[PDB]
Amino acid sequence: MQEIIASVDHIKFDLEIAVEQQLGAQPLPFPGMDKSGAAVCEFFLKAACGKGGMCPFRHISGEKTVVCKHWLRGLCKKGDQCEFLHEYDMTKMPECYFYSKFGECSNKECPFLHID
Amino acid sequence: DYINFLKGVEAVGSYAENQRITAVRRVYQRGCVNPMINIEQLWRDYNKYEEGINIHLAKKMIEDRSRDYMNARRVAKEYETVMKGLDRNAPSVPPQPQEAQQVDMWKKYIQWEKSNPLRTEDQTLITKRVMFAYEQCLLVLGHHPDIWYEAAQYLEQSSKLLAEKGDMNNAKLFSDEAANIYERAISTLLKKNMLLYFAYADYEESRMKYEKVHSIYNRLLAIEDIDPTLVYIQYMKFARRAEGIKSGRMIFKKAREDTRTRHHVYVTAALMEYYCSKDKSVAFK
Amino acid sequence: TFDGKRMRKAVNRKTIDYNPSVIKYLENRIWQRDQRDMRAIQPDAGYYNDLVPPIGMLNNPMNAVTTKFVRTSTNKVKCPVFVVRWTPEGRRLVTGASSGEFTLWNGLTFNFETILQAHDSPVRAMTWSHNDMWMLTADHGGYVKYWQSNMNNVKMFQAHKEAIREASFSPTDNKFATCSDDGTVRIWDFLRCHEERILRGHGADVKCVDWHPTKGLVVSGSKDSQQPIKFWDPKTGQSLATLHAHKNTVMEVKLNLNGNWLLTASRDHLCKLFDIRNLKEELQVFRGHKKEATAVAWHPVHEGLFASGGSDGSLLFWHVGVEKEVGGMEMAHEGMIWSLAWHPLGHILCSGSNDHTSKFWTRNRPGDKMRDRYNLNL
RNA sequence: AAUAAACA
Ligand SMILES: [Zn+2]
Ligand SMILES: [Zn+2]
Ligand SMILES: [Zn+2]
């Protein structure tokens, strides 16, 4: 099980040190980007982050109750100015447009919400 | 005469008139690619037919096929030179001065169409034009074996050339056409001429249709006044080569039982056993 | 109109799934040591399990002769597609049309994923990076955009006062080159959008640009018969060489990823190999395009073989060392082929016409009969 | 919400 014999839980690697204070992440070019594939910056949640707009990692805001439908396929033009959420929790999806308006749905594995 | 006939066909309404316009246009577009004498006049009638139904759209339809016409008009002037020297009316006579001088003008006309004046990679457009050059020459000098032989060898050459570049269904179309031009020689004009049989026998061995070959060889043996001494050599030379030693001796069994046979098949058969089956005693017996 | 708001029935889709082939190779390569150890894919329809991707059969590159048709992929506005690229994930397929639209077509099962109004001009050029990060595009107008993987619109800039026709990219995110119809090849800074240098002295409109995968060589092709193929020197700006190859109008120029072979499409019915370390002689030419050869794409996991478009829509497949072509579609892809793009796994090929369509081409299945209208019309 | 369903 790899954690009885060669355990590494007591090691503070240089890899984990490289990703807390982010170890020299360059302020990203072209300010109309998306910050995609980037997780979060802990400098923004605790205090002031330091750089605004042109920053590598993601800046989150509150009052996002519905996850983004475009974002699942991998097409997020909005990025962090998105009015929708970017998690993977299967409880904050939109209502399905064809179950809410047009009676029943069509496909068998519709992820979107079906409420009555 | 087919342009004026389609105009003569009575059509009432608008859809049947457009059926007339479609039918006359198709023969126009096909005929203005074909090299001939009065190609400058067909295009002149083409210009007046396009302007005769719609002047505005005539400026585009003439222009869209004009560049291919300029290739067709140029090669038609190139086609005048080799065709003005030929006779195209002489009866078919086997060689006996002027006759051999006529052959040179045919071999020029064959190899000039082999030189591909319409420079293209499409071997089907290349071959059928050379095949049209072959069929015109077989009318005038059909009793010549070389014109029959250079016909189907060009088809055997065009068979393996189309077998490489993807066109597989048309490779066998020219391959059976290669047997067809050989068939027309032995059936229509040159029945006692041995050379076109063996070209047709060795073509079918190259197509590996070995059962067909024995029908070809025995067709020649049914002909009364030939010398089968040469044929039994080659019909033994097929059986050893394609079917084994024992199949060869069955042929040499048939060579002994034919009255017309002379001494040369007895020379060949002992050399077929010694050089191939490596036996001295059978070659001695 | 089309907005995903009206309901449609449930349908199963034509799937070309590489996953049962790739899984098969992983199970194979454990106990396979070579291709001389491979179990044969006997020609029957029952041997649909034993397909491995073209990495599985490095030997025998005739695997990837993709003549089996899959799916015409047409839009609803009917514009002729010019450039075709796969996302380097093999996930989708952005495609450029004359109205300036990027229709992202699916990969395993092809549907449609989104439309874009990218360019104000007909799209002419499209390349990704060596990592999946940045996509480069260009058009008839002179504008070059950067694109992400999620197709975000980035800062755009007028690279040329006349119509760009290509853009290829250095082995990094630092440098690339766009040639246009003013006749120059301008090599660009990636990040600053800064005009590094102009490579003048060419004569007429240059319509393709290649970049050598290591050595830093910009190769070009031309309509100008006096200066048809120019090698360049990107750091200095000087003409390194000149190669007189074609009678007219070199269309598309592609180098291998192994770094040796130049390949050149041209409007004189020819594709030609040039070893770039010996420009005095000439390798084999490729004859068989009955009209002009307008699009060329090297195979990814097979060096040696490539597909070659035609202006009659003829789609032919070649191989280095083999004189005549292997695959064949004639009067079959209808129109004038502008570009080709293999899937990253070299197992399914795309196309694109001057007619308004853009077909997809997978490998021939085992033991089927090619009675299809592309292969044998009978 | 910016093409989720873009169908033969
Ligand atoms: Zn931040
Ligand atoms: Zn989003
Ligand atoms: Zn639903």
Curated annotation (Swiss-Prot), chain A:
Keywords: Host-virus interaction, Metal-binding, mRNA processing, Nucleus, Phosphoprotein, Repeat, RNA-binding, Zinc, Zinc-finger. It comes from the Eukaryota. A zinc finger (C3H1-type) spans 35-61, 62-89, 90-116. Its main location: nucleus. Coiled coil: none annotated. It is found in: Nucleus. GO terms for biological process: mRNA processing. One of its GO terms (cellular component) is intracellular membrane-bounded organelle. GO terms for molecular function: RNA binding; sequence-specific double-stranded DNA binding; zinc ion binding. Belongs to the CPSF4/YTH1 family. Component of the cleavage and polyadenylation specificity factor (CPSF) complex that play a key role in pre-mRNA 3'-end formation, recognizing the AAUAAA signal sequence and interacting with poly(A) polymerase and other factors to bring about cleavage and poly(A) addition. CPSF4 binds RNA polymers with a preference for poly(U). Component of the cleavage and polyadenylation specificity factor (CPSF) complex, composed of CPSF1, CPSF2, CPSF3, CPSF4 and FIP1L1. Interacts with FIP1L1. This is Cleavage and polyadenylation specificity factor subunit 4. The chain holds residues 1 to 116 of 269 of the full protein.
From Swiss-Prot, chain B:
GO terms for biological process: co-transcriptional mRNA 3'-end processing, cleavage and polyadenylation pathway; RNA 3'-end processing. The keyword Nucleus applies. Keywords: Acetylation, mRNA processing, Nucleus, Phosphoprotein, Repeat. One of its GO terms (molecular function) is RNA binding. It is found in: Nucleus. HAT repeats lie at residues 19-52, 77-115, 125-157, 173-206, 208-241. The keyword Phosphoprotein applies. Its main location: nucleus. GO terms for cellular component: mRNA cleavage stimulating factor complex; nucleoplasm; nucleus. Disulfide bonds: none annotated. It comes from the Eukaryota. Homodimer. The CSTF complex is composed of CSTF1 (50 kDa subunit), CSTF2 (64 kDa subunit) and CSTF3 (77 kDa subunit). CSTF3 directly interacts with CSTF1 and CSTF2. Interacts with FIP1L1. One of the multiple factors required for polyadenylation and 3'-end cleavage of mammalian pre-mRNAs. This is Cleavage stimulation factor subunit 3. The chain holds residues 145 to 431 of 717 of the full protein.
UniProtKB/Swiss-Prot annotation, chain C:
Essential for both cleavage and polyadenylation of pre-mRNA 3' ends. The modification N6-acetyllysine is found at K5. It comes from Homo sapiens (Human). Most highly expressed in testis. Component of the cleavage and polyadenylation specificity factor (CPSF) module of the pre-mRNA 3'-end processing complex. Interacts with CPSF3/CPSF73. This is pre-mRNA 3' end processing protein WDR33. It is found in: Nucleus. It comes from the Eukaryota. WD repeats lie at residues 76-115, 118-157, 159-198, 201-242, 245-284, 288-328, 332-371. Belongs to the WD repeat WDR33 family.
